[PDB]
Amino acid sequence: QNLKSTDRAVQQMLDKAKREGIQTVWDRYEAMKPQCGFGETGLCCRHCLQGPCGILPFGDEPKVGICGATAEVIVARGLDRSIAAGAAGHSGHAKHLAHTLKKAVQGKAASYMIKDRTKLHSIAKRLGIPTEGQKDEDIALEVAKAALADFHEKDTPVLWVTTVLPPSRVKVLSAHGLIPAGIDHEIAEIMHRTSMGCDADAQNLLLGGLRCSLADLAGCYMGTDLADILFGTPAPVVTESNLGVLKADAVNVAVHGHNPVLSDIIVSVSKEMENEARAAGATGINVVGICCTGNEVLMRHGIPACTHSVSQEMAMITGALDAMILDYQCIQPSVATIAECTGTTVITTMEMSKITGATHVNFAEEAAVENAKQILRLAIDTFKRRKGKPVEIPNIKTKVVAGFSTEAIINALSKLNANDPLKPLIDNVVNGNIRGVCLFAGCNNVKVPQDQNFTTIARKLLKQNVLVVATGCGAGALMRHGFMDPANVDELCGDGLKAVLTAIGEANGLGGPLPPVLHMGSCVDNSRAVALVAALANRLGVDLDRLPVVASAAEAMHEKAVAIGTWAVTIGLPTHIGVLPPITGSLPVTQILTSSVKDITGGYFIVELDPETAADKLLAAINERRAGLGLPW
Amino acid sequence: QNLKSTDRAVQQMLDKAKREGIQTVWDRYEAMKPQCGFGETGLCCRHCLQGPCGILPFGDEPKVGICGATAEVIVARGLDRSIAAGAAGHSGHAKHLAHTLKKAVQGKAASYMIKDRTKLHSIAKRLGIPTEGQKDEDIALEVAKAALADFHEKDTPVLWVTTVLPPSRVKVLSAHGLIPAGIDHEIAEIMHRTSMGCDADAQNLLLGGLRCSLADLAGCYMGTDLADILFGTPAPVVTESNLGVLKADAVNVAVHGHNPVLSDIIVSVSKEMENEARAAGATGINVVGICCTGNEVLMRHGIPACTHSVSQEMAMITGALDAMILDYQCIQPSVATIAECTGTTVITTMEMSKITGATHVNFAEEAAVENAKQILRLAIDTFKRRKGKPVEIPNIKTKVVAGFSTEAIINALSKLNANDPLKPLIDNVVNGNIRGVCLFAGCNNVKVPQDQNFTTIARKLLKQNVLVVATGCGAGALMRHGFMDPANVDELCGDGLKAVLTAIGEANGLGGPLPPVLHMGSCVDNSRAVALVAALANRLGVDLDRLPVVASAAEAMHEKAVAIGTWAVTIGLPTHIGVLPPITGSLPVTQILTSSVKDITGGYFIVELDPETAADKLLAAINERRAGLGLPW
Ligand code: SF4
Ligand code: SF4
Ligand code: FES
Ligand code: FES
Ligand SMILES: [Fe+3]
Ligand SMILES: [Fe+3]
């Protein structure tokens, strides 16, 4: 079981699933093997009905696609489409929040409101929206309008790109034609240019892809901005993670997917429904999180993280999960089948996201609270059906300190320097106490023993005094192995990093250090890491490609993670990916993405499947940036 | 050679290519075989880095994707993405024309103008744009603005859907949530919903796909509307088709791709450059068309069609093609390699469409004429380099009558009935002289002997008195085999259809019938067929799904043709496809697309690879509609 997941609760549930004859993601992976080498390497094209066209990586024919598409054209086109798909996911999330804010301030969705006035004003100033003497509702209406305008061509480029990066970075990108014109515009242009008989130049295609990845970044930053306005900017919180946060005595309700728009209401309403839960014979309603929707409610409300990503089915194998409430993205459709065995009620709530066999509740913001009550009532009924059933919740959980928004990180730092909060951090970068910054992002992947890359790399970097921050299922991997518990600072952190975490925490009235890893939120909250890095760049007077900052999508799966890794490269970061992306079938494309893009954006991909080697390579990237600033290392 | 293409000029050039060691599309197809059965059937998914996931059509494992995606989810998601890609091609074409018109009437692109005042006013009235007392330039500015607005969400749905179909059809579509909200919005939503862990219900996915196909229809209709405003509505023209329209003594210049924005200027400017061509020792400049850009200039100016689609390389094998001038879509990138052997200068002109090894001229409307001159000068230089070279142009061409816009068809009919032009057509439908209407659309496909399906089906339908109209490479196939020469009416048409073609032509001062097939233009001009069918529906008082009208993508290749076939189904037509689309790996998806969609939109796919059988099935669909109207058959 240890080759499947390094998570001991996951291993326990894998034993139970095996016992009970429930097929898992790892079983389905095993039945897939051996997987197709054309597709693994990127050398397959299905973009027209003359295909499929495969190209042998090595050897004889086929060597070229039927229309004459070369290996590097086919590889570049497939990669571009995955970037567009990731952009469309982060785009749709952000767009739905933009409409939600619009409805709220126009009197049409009373369940929603401006919860963060300060964030709303900051964003409007960053956008050029006049706030002086304006009502909050009108400012927010203008912010929502600008959000929706960034999806199409207009007078200006995508403002959630050009106003969030430092002017020098915008200038580098703009000299290369990389600034997106509109988010959905770029997505559509990708799909056009990659379709048969269109763009057939690897460099041209990849440049289009860098621009589309910045449209993805715009969607991420928009989604973060709007969720913060709507639901509050995260501040440090204490909670728990892993399957042990389920309670046999409670109605256990998982919020799963990505968009917090429904699940924030779920969290607020379940408090009122606790009495009706008690009448059903439960102790109450226990909301737990899965994947990024769980990260959102953990970040803002301290909702305990139940599990993530590849292991999501295991939450249901316990037999104690009464409801799993879905919006969209990264939901294994297998859940709808597994429910018939485990008694879980699986509830879809989004029109564009249905799963055959799952109960659908047609959620609308205009009636959010009522939908919430309905959904929770289904959960309560499900609990009633397992009164007296045996469950098996692994008694395994970790302590998680989280809520490290960029505003929270700055506020924490400001207790060491009120007028210049970034300076203590920069000071300790310069004197070597902090060697660099590494952002862990992205998913788990069934091909990698769950969490093994995240924790192996994290461990080596923390011993080398790297400040580690994390999002998404990277943050989930680290939280489930204790990397967010301050009690583990002694064991995990080098002396200089330990000193800095301890100074900041003890100056923030925690009596102890910050946790070993800083949890910066959901996958769209990778934008927060951008906000931090851009701030450091502005404070130092240098472009982002001169900072000792790296990223690692150590166990990447989703097309969103490919989009994210590509924009990390495009804004100038050495960007590791710990799973094989479909580019090895073309050496020229590989050379562009790992070497020559350095001369365009200053960032580059680091493809490395061995996590020890990957940690070495990330240390080398950090230290080369250090040397480029004339710092010791 | 006859198993490759039924075109005798193509066969001659295939002999020459074989002689000279130039690899062709058919050779590359042969080296691809045997092709992958997972991909052919649709049972492959690469939408995340846990894949590729294949599902065996029959037998043992793998039976399910790694995330639990079933065969019908995988099939529906792949089909939806191809519909979005086709939508993005027709979308990008239309968008570029919309910007071109905007620039023209704002004083920024003097090479462009309002060439069709009547079309501009008609379109504005159809859209609700006020024209009374407005300057033409301001009306056109409003029309361009509305065009660009249809790409994103706004107060209204996509007007190039809701104002071009009869109200009853809009009502049927709208009851099913099928009306697009914005063109690029729908494309992005497809890419979101089909990405990993999102929509996993075959019916939900396919409904999303029908809506996206209507976004494709909107792009098509927009592109037709705007090109007609900018360059003139086609009226009947006489010209020629096939390779024999090349002349050894001239500078031979192919316009190839889809968007007429550059190539219309090429046509106008080459007239002025004829003297400079003569000074180079040529007789002049001979512009010829390939694919849909060629269809555009054939439709408006009578430019001879040189070849189409699968056989495009053969135009260069002659050795007499001095320049091939590309915008985007359906260009085999092989041309850029083949040029090094044939001496042709291959010129790309679009930023999102480059081919390694091809000369790029950065075309801008603001300087169109100057770009045109530059491009033509390159052609002239190329001619100079083959002074005295032997060429081999097959002396094979057909006579083509074309230019049958819907306005032209109505004007022709109006000579039989001035006040009620649709009535003579309807009369002859009712008395059986016209059994029905069949639209031939779409590409050639290397898997089908070139043109064999188009001509076999056309022949059987014409003998049965079907009015046949055609677009795109379907029109190209029929024109190259004489189906657009009125001299062949006697041989090809049944007596009743012959009678109708003869009455209309003799009443239009042609001294003979209309040609056997009516050429309605490029692939976006499939919208013209919609305009005709909607008009017939409005004139009869019935929805489109009650009319004896069918469509045939007899040799479909491109994702655009899949989008087109899907919207033909969505607006209510029996819609044949003569190539295997990637849906056979899922029986439920096949059942939806060929049977149960009848109960939603009234149309349905007819999948049939045998063209004799397909003709029978199209006759049966037509006659079942006839019976449903209570007509004899
Ligand atoms: S676009 Fe080219 S490479 Fe792709 S499937 Fe079609 S013929 Fe093959
Ligand atoms: S989305 Fe599902 S079926 Fe597709 S590649 Fe990923 S795991 Fe396999
Ligand atoms: S040949 Fe296997 S991915 Fe296409
Ligand atoms: S397995 Fe061949 S198309 Fe993917
Ligand atoms: Fe996740
Ligand atoms: Fe074509």
Numbering used by the authors:
A (entry chain A), B (entry chain A): 4 to 636
Direct quotes from the study:
Among viologen-utilizing biocatalysts, Ni–Fe carbon monoxide dehydrogenases (CODHs) with a unique [NiFe4S4OHx] cluster (E.C.1.2.7.4)12,13 serve as suitable model enzymes for studying viologen mediator interaction sites. CODHs have high-resolution 3D structural information available and share highly conserved structures as simple homodimers. In the homodimeric ChCODH2 structure, the active site C-cluster is deeply buried on the protein surface, distinct from the B and D clusters. In this study, we identified the viologen interaction site in ChCODHs (Ch, Carboxydothermus hydrogenoformans) through systematic alanine substitutions of aromatic surface residues, which disrupted enzyme activity.
Notably, the R57G/N59L mutant displayed a 10-fold enhanced mediator affinity (Km ≈ 0.2 mM at 30 °C) compared to WT without compromising the catalytic rate (kcat ≈ 2,100 at 30 °C). The dissociation constant (Kd) values were 449 µM for WT and 144 µM for R57G/N59L, showing that WT has approximately four times lower affinity than R57G/N59L. The overall structure of the R57G/N59L variant, including B, C, and D clusters, was highly similar to that of WT (RMSD of 0.240 Å for 604 Cα). However, the local environment around Gly57 was notably altered due to the mutation, leading to the formation of a cavity (cavity volume: 38.45 Å3 for R57G/N59L, no cavity for WT). This structural change, particularly the enlarged cavity, appears to indirectly influence viologen interaction by altering the spatial arrangement around the interaction site. Analysis of the catalytic properties of R57 and N59 variants revealed significantly different reaction kinetics for viologen reduction compared to WT. Specifically, these mutations seem to mitigate the repulsive effect between the positively charged electron mediator oxidized EV and Arg57, thereby facilitating easier access for viologen molecules. The formation of complex structures appeared to be influenced by high concentrations of polyethylene glycol (PEG, 25% (v/v)) in the crystallization solution, potentially interfering viologen access to D clusters.
